[PDB]
Every structure is written in C-alpha cells, then in structure tokens.
Amino acid sequence: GLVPRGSHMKTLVIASLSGGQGKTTTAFFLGKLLSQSAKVLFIDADPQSNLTFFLGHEVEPSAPTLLELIKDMVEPADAVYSLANSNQFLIPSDDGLSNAQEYLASSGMGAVVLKARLKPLSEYFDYCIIDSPPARTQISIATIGAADQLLIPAEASTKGVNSLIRTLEIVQSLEKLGAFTGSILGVIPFRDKWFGLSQSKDSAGAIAAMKEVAPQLRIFPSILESERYKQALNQGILLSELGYPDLEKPFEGVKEALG
Numbered sequence: 001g002l003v004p005r006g007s008h009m010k011t012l013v014i015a016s017l018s019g020g021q022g023k024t025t026t027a028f029f030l031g032k033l034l035s036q037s038a039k040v041l042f043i044d045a046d047p048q049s050n051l052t053f054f055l056g057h058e059v060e061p062s063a064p065t066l067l068e069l070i071k072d073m074v075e076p077a078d079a080v081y082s083l084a085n086s087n088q089f090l091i092p093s094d095d096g097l098s099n100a101q102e103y104l105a106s107s108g109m110g111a112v113v114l115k116a117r118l119k120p121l122s123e124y125f126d127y128c129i130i131d132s133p134p135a136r137t138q139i140s141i142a143t144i145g146a147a148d149q150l151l152i153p154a155e156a157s158t159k160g161v162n163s164l165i166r167t168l169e170i171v172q173s174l175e176k177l178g179a180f181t182g183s184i185l186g187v188i189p190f191r192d193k194w195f196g197l198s199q200s201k202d203s204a205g206a207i208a209a210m211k212e213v214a215p216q217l218r219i220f221p222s223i224l225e226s227e228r229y230k231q232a233l234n235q236g237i238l239l240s241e242l243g244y245p246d247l248e249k250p251f252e253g254v255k256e257a258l259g
Helices: 022-034 050-054 067-071 095-105 110-124 138-145 158-176 202-212 229-236 245-256
Strands: 008-012 038-045 087-090 127-131 151-156 183-190
Touching: 022 050, 022 151, 022 183, 022 229, 022 245, 038 050, 050 095, 067 095, 067 110, 067 138, 087 110, 095 110, 095 138, 110 138, 138 158, 138 202, 151 158, 158 183, 158 202, 183 202
Parallel strands: 008 127, 008 151, 038 087, 038 127, 151 183
Antiparallel strands: none
C-alpha cells in the first residue's frame, strides 16, 4: 500500500502540442532529479508509452493502468506502481490508452477529468510529473487541466516556435473555461544545435523568437542537441551517472525554479 504523509502534491505537466523527444526526455530526467529527496509520481499519458518503457516498467496483461483510472474503472491507487527507486512511482500506459479519447470527449468535461481522478493521491506524493501526448487530443487537454505548473518544451527551430504559439493559445482557452488553474512555469527549448564554440544561427534565431512571442514567460537554458540523452534513457540512468553532468544542468535549473 501507500504510506500517506501530510504533503500537498504539486502536479507538473510537460506539454508541447507537437512531436519530438523533448517532453519524454524532460519528464524522465526531471522526475529522477526530483526524486533525489522527494516522493515522485510519474504519469505516462502518451499512447506511445515511452516513459513507461524508459522507466523499466512492463505492464502485465490484465493490469489496470492510466486508461482504467481515467474511465473510473478502478481506485486511483490500484493504477500506481512502484519502480526500482524507492521514491518513484508510475501510473503507466500501454496500447489502447487512446480509447480514453472517446470517453473524455463524450463526458463534456474531459479537461478536468484527470485533475479529479488524481485528487485522492494528493497526500501521498510531493510531485506528480506528467508526460503528455505529442498532439492536441482529449488526453493532452486533460493533462493540461490537471496541472499546477506547466512546462513547455519547444524545438529550437521555426516549427518549434509555431508549436509554442499553438500551445499557448490552447492553454489560454482552457484558462478562460476554468480548466487550467495553474501557472506556466516556463519554456525549455530543446534540440539546440551548437558547432562547438558557436551556435546554429537557426537555433539562435528560434530561441530569440520565443522571447518575442512570449515575453512574459521564463525561457530556461536549453537542452542541447545530443545523442547522450537517448543513451542515458536507454540504460535508465541520469546523465551525471552516465558521465555527462553538463547536459543535466537545464533540468537542475527547472528543479531550482520549483523550490
């Protein structure tokens, strides 16, 4: 079972309404860093289920997951699984999580369903980290609804900037309807190309344009373009442990802004 403390769980949602390895990468490393001295609940709200894979969890055949939780087929704790780390837990996802789409649409209140489904767990964790689907979908909107704090990864490219723009309007509209009651923690640009001492004019331009579009948002130091992220992910370890601590700094920076 779950040992309940006196905590009030802060839900942090990694949402970019476009594809790329950024959300999953950020959820994974950020969740692990937070767990160093706090109890962390991971939620893999992506039907690809990469976060579940990279955390080393495999869903057993008839086991209840995020889908059962969303559709209210099970107590919220029955969908929580412990991981190797004593401070990390997971509401996993697998194949037919996209069946939550219809359920959420047809409820008339999809954007607050997940928020409601998670309240029973508030007292058991310090942080909840949600990896959201890489498009605008009912599930994606529900993850945003659930947020106390929203972190927007954005590719350091023209496509990344437009993606950020779409995402901010979706949030703005969820705010007006009373679904989104959190705040935007900031933007973390990723796939920022450097050629040693000098950065790509394209990356530089895109990040510069991100400040123009959202002048009120914090733009975090970027996640460099690097194959190391995927290498650490594949082995289920931190970048510092893999032996590349510098690559871990932008996640540390987000952790800092959370305390």
